[PDB]
Amino acid sequence: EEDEEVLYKVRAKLFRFDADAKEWKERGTGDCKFLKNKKTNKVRILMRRDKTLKICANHIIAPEYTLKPNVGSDRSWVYACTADIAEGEAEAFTFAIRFGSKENADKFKEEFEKAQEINKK
C-alpha cells in the first residue's frame, strides 16, 4: 500500500449477503480505506481486520456502484460489488458496511461519490 495515498479512513463493520441462508454474514471489522493508486489515479476500498490484519475488502469504487440504505439501519449502506479480490479470485458480492454513527455513514457516502468521480476521469 506504499504506492497509494489515503483519501479517507473510517472504522466500519463489513457484511456480505448469503442468498442461500437469506442472512447477512459479518466479513470483518477494522479500518476501511479509500486508496488512490499514484500511477493510475484509481481509488479502491481496502479494508483489513483488527489484530489479524487480513483483507476483508479489496475492490475498485466503480462509477456504476450505488450505495442504498438497509431497512434496519440509519448508519449503513448496501451495494453490489462485481469484482472483490479479498478471498483471491474476483467474486461478485452484495456488501453492507456499517459505521459508528449516521454522521460517519453520510461522510463515507460523500467520500465514495468523490472517489467515483476521480475514477470517471
Binding site: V71, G72, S73, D74
Partner: protein, 995 residues
C-alpha cells in the same frame, strides 16, 4: 469402494481399512471428510470389536491399530462383563502380548509411542475390570517382566503411572465409590512392591528415558502415597541432587519436589524439619551451580525461549512458591538458613520480572501470602527489607488498569501491604519514576498510565499529613509534565492521569474545599474538550469524586454564598452543552447522588425540581404538542429527544431511589399516555410495513421509549419505601397501560422488559395486590408460553424474564395459581418441566427453584382437595421428569438442585404428607402405603428406561437412595453411583451399600 469396510456380511479387508484411515489422517477436503464418516460408522458398529484382533495382527498402518484399540476400549469399559471368562482371558493375553512384542522390537518402541501408550491404557482399562480379584499375579508378573528388558521396564512404569491416574486422579466421576475404594486399597496393598521397583531403577538406573518414565510415575504416586516412602528412604536426596543435575530429569524432578512439598507430614519432628530444609537447600544449590545463578536475567532467558526454558522457569516458580508458602518459617529462625531463604526469594524476584502474565499471577499470589504475613507476624518484616524494596518496583512497573478487576485487586493489595511496611521507600520509588517521565528517559503513554494507576492504588495507606505532601508533589509534577508536553494527544493523556489520581484521593479533596472546587470547575472545562476520551474521563471523574465527597457539595462551605450543588444546577445547561447524551445522563446521575444527601424533605424536592428543570420543560412542550397533534411522534428527531428525557429520569432515579417519587409523580400520567401512544404507532407500523418494521430505526426508536418508561418504573419501585403510594398511585395505571398492550401485540412486537417490570412489581408489592397478580398472570402467562414452547432458542429474553416472573409469583402470591383454571394450571406444571429440559442455565435454575417452591407451597396447604388432586395429577410427573434430567447426561450443571428436588419429592411420601393413595384402585393391594408403591413405580420406571440393569441393581439402588432421603451429600453419592452403573453392563448391586 471405501464404504466396503461398513459391510460386515463379508470379512474385513485390512488393506481397504488402511487406505480409509490413511485418507482420513493424510487426505484433504472431500476425501478426508468421507473417510471420516466411514471410520466413525465402522467404530460405532456394535460388532466392530470382533474385528480388533484381526486388525492388530494383520494391519500395516499404526493409525488403524489405534482406532482398533478405541473400539476395544468401548467394549472393555461398557460390555466387558457380558463376555465369557475364557474370552476375557483371550483379550487380556492378546493385549499383554502386543505390548511385550512392541517393546522387544527397538525400532517399534522408539517410533510407535502413540500405539504403545494406547495399548498400555487399554491394559489399564482391563485392570480396572479384572484386577486384583480376577488377576492376583498382575503386579508380581509386571515386577518380574521388568528385569527382562529396559524397554519393558520403561513401558511398565507407563502402565503403573496410568493405573495410578485412573484409580486416584480420575476415579471420582468414572467409578462407583465402592469400586474406587476397592482399587485404591488394592494399589495401596501392593505399593511396597511397586516402590521397591521404582527406587531400584532410580538408584541403579542408567537409561534417561527409563529414569524419566519412573519419575513420571512417581509424580502420580506422590498424590496419594504416605510420606514415609519419601522421608524414610534415600529418595529425597536423589530427587534434590542427582536428578536436578541432568536436564533430561530436571523438569519432572522439580514437579515431584513440588508434590513432595505438599505431602501430609508430622509437625512435631525436628528430623523431618531438617530433611524438609535439606531437600530445599540441595535443589537451590543444584539450580545455582547447574542451571543459573541468583543474579541471572530470567526475563531475558524466558523471552529467548530456548528449548524447555519457559516450562522449567514456570516449574521453578511453582516449586519455590509452593515450598515457601508452607515452609519459609523453617528457614526464618536460624542464621545459617538466612542466605538460602533470601536466595529462594531473590529467584522469585527474578521470576516476577518475566513478561508472561500467567506466570506473574502465580508469583503475585505468593507475594500476597508473604507481605500479608509480614503485615501481621511479629519480628519478620526486617528479614525481607531488600526483597520488599525490589518487589515495590516490580509491582509499580506491572500495575494494570482497574478494569482488569482480579489482577488490579491482587496488585493493589500487595502494594498497600508493601506501602505500610515502608511508606518512604514506596514514595521515593513513585517520585523517582515520575522524574523519569518528566526527564523523558522513560516517557510513554503506557508508562505514565501505569505509574498513575500505581499511585492511585495506594490511596488511604499513608497518614493524612504524608498523603497531603505526597499528593501535592504528584499533582505539581503531573502539571509540569502537562505544560511541558506538545500536541493535544500528549496533553490528553496527562490530563486523564491527573483526573485519575485526583479521583483516587477523596480524603485530600474533603480536607481542601478550595482544591475540590477548582477540580470540579476544571472537570467542567474538560466537558467542552471534544478531544477523544477527555469528556468521558471528566464525567467519570465527576461522578467518582461525587460518590466519595457528596456531603461537601450539599453544605454551605465557609466563604461560599450557597451549597455548591446549587451552583452546579444553575449552570447545568452551559456545563453539559457539548456532551453526548450518555455523558449528560452520567452528569445528572452524579447530581442525583448529591441531592440524596439533603435529608430536609422540602430542600431535597426543591433541588430535584431545579435539577429536572431542562428535561421537564422539553417534556412539557413535547406533551403540549404531542397532545395537540398525535402525528408529531412519527418525527425521528422528537423520538430521540423523548427517549433522552426518559433516560435522564432513569439516571436520576438510579441515584435517588425513594427520593425520586415527586419527579415520577410530575411525569407519571403523561408518561403512561406516551407509552400507549407509542404502542399504537408501533402496532400501526407493523400492520402497514410487516414484521420488518420492528427492525427499522423509527420503530426501534419508539420501542426505546417504551423500554426506558418500563426501566424508569422498575427502577423507582425496586427502591420505593412508600409501598402504599406504589399500590395506590402507580400500579393500577401501569397494569392498564402495559398488560393489554403486551397481550394484544404480535409476539415480535412484545417487550420482554414488561415481564421484568412485572417481576419487580410482584417482588415489592405482590402481597398487597392479589387481584393485580392474577391480572398479570392472565395477561402474560399463556401468550408468553406460546412464544417459548416450540424450541429452546426463540425469544431468549422472554424465556428468561418469563421464568423469573413465574418464580416470584410462586414465592409471593401462590394464590394466583389457585385462581388459574385446571387447563391453565396443567400448562404451568408443563412450563416448569419445560424449564428443566433447558440447556440455558438461567431458565433451568429458575425451573428447578419453581418446582422446589411449588412442592413447599402445596405441602403448606395441608390435607385439602387441591393438594390431594395436585399429588394424584403431578407427583409422578415431577419424580420422572427429575429422574430424566438426572440420568440423560445433557443437564449436569443442574445435578445438585435436581437431587435436592428428587429428595424433597421422595421425602413427602416418607413423612406421609400425601393423604390419598397415588396408585389407582386394583393396581396393587388397597391397603398399600404410598411409600411401598413409590418404590414399585420407580423400579418399573428404571427397568423400562434402563433395561440392561438387573432387578437386583435397581432394587439395591432404590433401597439405598430412599434411606438417604434426609442426607443430601450421601443421596448425591448414590445418584452418582447409579449414573456410573447405567453406562455399563453388570454393575455390582452391593456398590449401593457403600458407607
Amino acid at each position: 469402494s471405501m464404504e466396503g469396510i461398513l459391510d460386515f456380511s463379508n470379512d474385513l479387508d485390512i488393506a481397504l481399512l488402511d487406505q480409509v484411515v490413511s485418507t482420513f489422517y493424510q487426505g484433504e477436503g472431500v476425501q478426508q471428510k468421507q473417510a471420516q464418516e466411514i471410520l466413525t460408522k465402522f467404530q460405532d458398529n456394535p460388532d466392530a470389536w470382533e474385528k480388533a484382533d484381526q486388525i492388530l495382527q494383520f494391519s500395516t498402518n499404526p493409525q488403524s491399530k489405534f482406532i482398533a484399540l478405541s473400539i476395544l476400549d468401548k467394549l472393555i469399559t461398557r460390555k466387558w462383563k457380558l463376555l465369557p471368562n475364557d474370552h476375557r482371558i483371550g483379550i487380556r493375553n492378546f493385549v499383554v502380548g502386543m505390548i511385550i512384542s512392541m517393546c522387544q522390537d527397538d525400532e517399534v518402541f522408539k517410533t510407535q509411542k502413540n500405539l504403545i501408550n494406547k495399548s498400555d491404557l487399554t491394559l489399564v482399562q482391563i485392570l480396572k475390570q479384572e484386577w486384583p480379584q480376577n488377576w492376583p499375579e498382575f503386579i508380581p508378573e509386571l515386577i518380574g517382566s521388568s528385569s527382562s528388558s529396559v524397554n519393558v521396564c520403561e513401558n511398565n512404569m507407563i502402565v503403573l503411572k496410568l493405573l495410578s491416574e485412573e484409580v486416584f486422579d480420575f476415579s471420582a466421576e468414572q467409578m462407583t465409590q465402592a469400586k474406587a475404594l476397592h482399587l485404591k486399597n488394592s494399589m495401596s496393598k501392593e505399593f511396597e512392591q511397586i516402590f521397591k521397583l521404582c527406587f531400584q531403577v532410580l538408584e541403579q538406573g542408567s537409561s534417561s528415558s527409563l529414569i524419566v518414565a519412573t519419575l513420571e510415575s512417581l509424580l502420580r504416586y506422590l498424590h496419594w502415597i504416605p510420606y514415609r516412602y519419601i522421608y524414610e528412604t534415600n529418595i529425597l536426596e536423589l530427587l534434590s541432587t542427582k536428578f536436578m543435575t541432568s536436564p533430561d530429569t530436571r523438569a519432572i524432578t522439580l514437579k515431584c519436589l513440588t508434590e513432595v512439598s505438599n505431602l501430609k507430614i508430622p509437625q512435631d519432628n525436628d528430623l523431618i524439619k531438617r530433611q524438609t530444609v535439606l531437600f530445599f537447600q540441595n535443589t537451590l544449590q543444584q539450580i545455582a551451580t547447574s542451571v543459573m545463578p541468583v543474579t541471572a536475567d530470567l526475563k531475558a532467558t524466558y523471552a529467548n525461549a530456548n528449548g524447555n526454558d519457559q516450562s522449567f522457569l514456570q516449574d521453578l516458580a511453582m516449586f519455590l512458591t509452593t515450598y515457601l508458602a508452607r515452609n519459609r518459617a523453617l528457614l526464618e529462625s536460624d542464621e545459617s538458613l538466612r542466605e538460602l531463604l533470601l536466595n529462594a526469594h531473590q529467584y522469585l524476584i527474578q521470576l516476577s520480572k518475566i513478561e508472561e502474565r500467567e506466570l506473574f499471577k502465580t508469583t503475585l499470589d505468593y507475594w500476597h501470602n508473604l507481605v500479608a504475613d509480614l503485615f501481621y507476624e511479629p519480628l519478620k518484616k526486617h528479614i525481607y527489607e531488600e526483597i520488599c524494596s525490589q518487589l515495590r518496583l516490580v509491582i509499580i512497573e506491572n500495575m494494570v488498569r482497574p478494569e482488569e478487576i482480579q489482577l488490579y485487586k491482587s496488585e493493589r493489595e500487595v502494594l498497600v501491604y508493601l506501602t505500610h511496611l515502608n511508606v518512604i521507600d514506596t514514595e521515593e520509588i513513585m517520585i523517582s519514576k515520575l522524574a523519569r517521565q518528566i526527564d523523558g528517559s522513560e516517557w510513554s503513554w503506557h508508562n505514565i498510565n501505569t505509574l498513575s494507576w500505581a499511585i492511585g492504588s495506594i490511596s488511604g495507606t499513608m497518614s493524612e499529613k504524608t498523603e497531603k505532601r505526597f499528593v501535592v508533589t504528584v499533582i505539581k509534577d503531573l502539571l509540569g509534565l502537562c505544560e511541558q508536553k506538545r500536541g493535544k494527544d500528549n496533553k490528553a493523556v496527562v490530563a486523564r492521569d491527573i483526573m485519575y489520581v485526583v479521583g483516587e484521593y477523596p480524603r485530600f479533596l474533603k480536607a481542601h474545599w478550595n482544591f475540590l472546587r477548582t477540580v470540579i470547575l476544571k472537570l467542567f472545562e474538560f466537558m467542552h474538550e471534544t478531544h477523544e476520551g477527555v469528556q468521558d474521563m471528566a464525567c467519570d471523574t465527576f461522578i467518582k469524586i461525587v460518590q466519595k465527597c457528596k456531603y461537601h457539595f450539599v453544605i454551605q462551605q465557609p466563604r461560599e454564598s450557597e451549597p455548591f450543588i446549587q451552583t452546579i444546577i444553575r449552570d447545568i445547561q452551559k456545563t453539559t452543552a457539548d456532551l453526548q447524551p450518555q455523558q449528560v445522563h452520567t452528569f445528572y446521575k452524579a447530581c442525583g447522588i448529591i441531592i440524596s444527601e439533603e435529608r430536609s424533605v422540602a430542600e431535597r424536592n426543591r433541588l430535584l425540581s431545579d435539577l429536572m428543570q431542562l428535561p421537564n420543560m422539553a417534556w412539557d412542550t413535547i406533551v403540549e404538542q404531542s397532545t395537540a397533534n398525535p402525528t408529531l411522534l412519527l418525527d425521528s428527531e422528537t423520538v430521540k429527544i423523548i427517549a433522552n428525557i426518559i433516560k435522564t429520569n432513569v439516571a436520576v432515579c438510579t441515584s435517588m431511589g425513594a427520593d425520586f417519587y415527586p419527579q415520577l409523580g410530575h411525569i407519571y400520567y403523561n408518561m403512561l399516555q406516551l407509552y400507549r401512544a407509542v404502542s399504537s404507532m408501533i402496532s400501526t407500523q407493523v400492520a402497514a410495513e410487516g414484521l420488518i418494521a420492528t427492525k427499522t430505526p423509527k420503530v426501534r426508536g419508539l420501542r426505546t421509549i417504551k423500554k426506558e418508561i418500563l426501566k424508569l418504573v422498575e427502577t423507582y419501585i425496586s427502591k420505593a419505601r412508600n409501598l402504599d403510594d406504589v399500590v395506590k398511585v402507580l400500579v393500577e395505571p401501569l397494569l392498564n397501560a402495559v398488560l393489554e398492550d403486551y397481550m394484544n401485540n404480535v409476539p415480535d412486537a412484545r417487550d420482554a422488559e414488561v415481564l421484568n417490570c412485572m417481576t419487580t412489581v410482584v417482588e415489592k408489592v405482590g402481597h398487597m395486590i392479589p387481584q393485580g397478580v392474577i391480572l398479570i398472570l392472565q395477561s402474560v402467562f399463556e401468550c408468553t408460553l406460546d412464544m417459548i414452547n416450540k424450541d429452546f432458542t426463540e425469544y431468549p429474553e422472554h424465556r428468561v424474564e418469563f421464568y423469573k416472573l413465574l418464580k416470584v409469583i410462586n414465592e409471593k402470591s401462590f394464590a394466583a395459581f389457585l385462581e388459574l383454571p385446571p387447563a391453565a394450571f396443567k400448562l404451568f406444571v408443563d412450563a416448569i418441566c419445560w424449564a428443566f429440559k433447558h440447556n440455558n442455565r438461567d431458565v433451568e435454575v429458575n425451573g428447578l427453584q419453581i418446582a422446589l417452591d411449588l412442592v413447599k407451597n402445596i405441602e403448606r396447604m395441608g390435607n385439602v382437595p387441591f393438594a390431594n388432586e395436585f399429588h394424584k395429577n403431578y407427583f409422578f410427573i415431577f419424580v420422572s421428569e427429575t429422574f430424566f434430567v438426572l440420568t440423560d447426561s445433557d443437564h449436569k450443571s443442574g445435578f445438585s438442585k435436581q437431587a435436592l428436588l428428587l429428595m424433597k419429592l421422595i421425602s413427602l411420601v416418607y413423612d406421609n404428607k400425601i393423604s390419598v393413595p397415588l396408585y389407582q384402585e386394583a393396581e396393587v393391594p388397597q391397603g398399600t402405603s404410598n411409600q411401598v408403591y413409590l418404590s414399585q413405580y420407580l423400579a418399573n420406571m428404571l427397568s423400562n428406561a434402563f433395561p440392561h440393569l438387573t432387578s437386583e441393581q435397581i432394587a439395591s439402588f432404590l433401597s439405598a437412595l430412599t434411606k438417604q432421603c434426609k442426607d443430601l451429600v450421601v443421596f448425591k453419592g448414590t445418584l452418582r453411583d447409579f449414573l456410573v452403573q447405567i453406562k455399563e453392563v453388570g454393575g455390582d448391586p452391593t456398590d449401593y451399600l457403600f458407607a
